[PDB]
Amino acid sequence: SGPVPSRARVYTDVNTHRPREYWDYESHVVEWGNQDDYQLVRKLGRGKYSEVFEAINITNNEKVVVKILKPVKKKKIKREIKILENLRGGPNIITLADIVKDPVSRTPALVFEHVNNTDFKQLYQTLTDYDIRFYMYEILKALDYCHSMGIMHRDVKPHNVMIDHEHRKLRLIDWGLAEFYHPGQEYNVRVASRYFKGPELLVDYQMYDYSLDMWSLGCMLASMIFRKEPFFHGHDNYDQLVRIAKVLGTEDLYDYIDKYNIELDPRFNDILGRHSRKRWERFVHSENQHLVSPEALDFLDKLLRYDHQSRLTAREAMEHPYFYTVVKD
Numbered sequence: 001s002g003p004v005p006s007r008a009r010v011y012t013d014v015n016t017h018r019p020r021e022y023w024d025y026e027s028h029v030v031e032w033g034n035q036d037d038y039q040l041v042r043k044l045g046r047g048k049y050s051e052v053f054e055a056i057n058i059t060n061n062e063k064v065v066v067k068i069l070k071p072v073k074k075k076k077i078k079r080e081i082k083i084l085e086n087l088r089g090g091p092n093i094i095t096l097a098d099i100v101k102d103p104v105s106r107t108p109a110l111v112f113e114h115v116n117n118t119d120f121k122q123l124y125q126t127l128t129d130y131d132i133r134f135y136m137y138e139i140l141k142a143l144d145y146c147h148s149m150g151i152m153h154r155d156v157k158p159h160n161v162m163i164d165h166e167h168r169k170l171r172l173i174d175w176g177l178a179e180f181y182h183p184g185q186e187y188n189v190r191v192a193s194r195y196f197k198g199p200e201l202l203v204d205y206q207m208y209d210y211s212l213d214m215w216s217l218g219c220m221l222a223s224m225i226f227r228k229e230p231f232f233h234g235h236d237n238y239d240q241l242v243r244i245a246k247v248l249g250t251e252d253l254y255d256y257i258d259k260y261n262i263e264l265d266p267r268f269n270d271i272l273g274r275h276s277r278k279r280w281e282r283f284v285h286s287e288n289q290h291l292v293s294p295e296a297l298d299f300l301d302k303l304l305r306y307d308h309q310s311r312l313t314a315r316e317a318m319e320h321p322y323f324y325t326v327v328k329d
């Protein structure tokens with residue numbers, strides 16, 4: 001009895017066949033740079049796990065960004081550092097430039113390339129149909145890369161997608177929640193922002209994979225093309241699943257949990273209800289129709305599936321007709 005196991009349908013065995021040093025981040029040995037190379041200019045932001053500063057690298061006169069990690073498990077720190085080093089140079093992956101020991105926090109400070117960002121409230125108010133297709137494709141490059149390298153991001157959301165719109169430059173950031181995918185491994189479901197959490201997380205299914213990121217990407221896409229941010233706006237993790245079910249319907253939710261022999265929290269008995277699956281056209285109106293096309297809706301439809309094994313992979317997504325109009329390098 002109990003839930004049915006699951007495996008990724010792609011990149012299943014990447015970490016199996018890479019050497020142990022690649023994924024065994026607990027044994028990684030950090031090469032420290034010199035903290036005096038970087039002069040902090042201003043604080044950019046603060047989160048649960050870090051503070052971020054604009055800085056100058058006074059050895060080359062280049063702007064950088066410094067992420068000073070808040071005290072946390074050595075394991076979580078080494079995990080992020082190892083993942084960043086493994087992915088460095090990949091398409092639209094934020095580039096780790098240095099690692100220093102901050103003298104005040106006495107924790108690692110990660111030094112990254114500087115991206116001249118516009119925060120996603122003003123940007124998302126402007127982006128055209130063409131812009132959204134372009135930047136989605138750029139996100140997909142990053143996701144196929146990290147998935148192909150055995151890593152799931154697990155925190156895909158607008159805040160973690162930096163865009164310097166002037167230079168049409170995109171970087172996927174904050175790999176602090178990212179993990180190595182190992183077939184059969186059970187993972188923490190307390191990942192991703194509420195609004196971007198996949199159904200697998202919301203029904204407490206731990207044996208998930210790269211396809212989690214594709215659900216999150218779908219949530220981003222829906223918010224952008226329908227001009228509703230966030231799209232699934234739950235007030236807590238339970239209501240989050242109810243909001244999803246009011247769109248995707250309850251019958252396919254039950255098919256999903258029945259497939260994996262998953263049982264819903266009895267707390268859903270009085271709040272879930274019975275809901276038909278809705279057609280995506282109902283979210284189209286005169287103020288977002290310029291961002292919507294049959295191709296957009298089909299693409300969105302193929303990302304937002306309950307069954308994590310049924311979602312487009314990043315590579316499959318890049319083959320979708322939605323991207324036919326995007327100029328390719």
Ligand SMILES: COc1cc(/C=C(\C#N)C(=O)Nc2nnc(C(F)(F)F)s2)ccc1O
Pocket residue numbers: 044045047050052054065067094112114115116117173174175176
């Ligand atoms: C929060 O985690 C990260 C954050 C960042 C970078 C930024 C953040 N947050 C970042 O560069 N933010 C900026 N905000 N304004 C910038 C400006 F105005 F200087 F362009 S950069 C890079 C890697 C990370 O893992």
